[PDB]
Subunit: 105 residues, 3 copies
Amino acid sequence: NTASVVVLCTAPDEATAQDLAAKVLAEKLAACATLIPGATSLYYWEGKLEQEYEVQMILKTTVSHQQALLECLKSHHPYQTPELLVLPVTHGDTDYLSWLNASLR
Amino acid sequence: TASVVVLCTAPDEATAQDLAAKVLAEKLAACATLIPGATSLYYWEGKLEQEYEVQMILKTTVSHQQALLECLKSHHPYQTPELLVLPVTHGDTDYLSWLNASL
Amino acid sequence: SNTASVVVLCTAPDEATAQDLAAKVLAEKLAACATLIPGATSLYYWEGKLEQEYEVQMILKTTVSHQQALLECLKSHHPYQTPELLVLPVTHGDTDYLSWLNASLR
Ligand SMILES: [Hg+2]
Ligand SMILES: [Hg+2]
Ligand SMILES: [Hg+2]
Ligand SMILES: [Hg+2]
């Protein structure tokens, strides 16, 4: 029984976000994906301010599967450079955690 | 006073608002934020489920953490809320003072 | 040589406010990317009545070296100098993304 972690990744739209989630679930690299639509990203690129629609993905997994999950997401990105960050979890519901660990075989 | 962010999931905005109001009244959280319209994907019994959900983001202090996790768990139909606690390393000092001024 | 990253959460009332705020902190190189999430409602007691209010949740990505200046700027822009502002530590991951967030800021 398994420490958890929350992985944030950005997708350009709902269909991409959905398909991504499906794949990493199928591979048992995450137990649950949460997808938040409607977001805007702003950032400079090559000297210009960009403003883009996004879906914020929130992926729940254990510290044992974190590197492979990260590897998988980076493999699917068109330029192998996903906006991908890991936040530490300092506590779960231990029953939800039991399910999370069980889901990952 | 240190603060934490608690994440939890509710099936619809109506139960999510009810639960927010209750934990705020019991002074287990200072602020509860709700984002409906989320999609959650996961496996059940070998088939992929896809449901709409409301993401909850609850702000509280470490000294109120356990008691929050407990009213939340009691409250969940099967007693297994999707509940995850994130550490906060810093922030606004005046905001944080107000967080603690609840209790 | 890359610095650690952080996530800064800040709350804004609406898209116009949040987008003006993001543009200014970006132009000043205090954050590398700002994500705005509309659709949030917050509930809290204030003077001491239960309020419910619509919000835009801001997620700002920056380095530990620029954290304090970012906090200071956002605070200064807030109409009461008291922004709902929290910092979360990042423990990993994508090295190219991290290299870009660093290059963005100097
Ligand atoms: Hg889930
Ligand atoms: Hg993969
Ligand atoms: Hg309760
Ligand atoms: Hg400023």
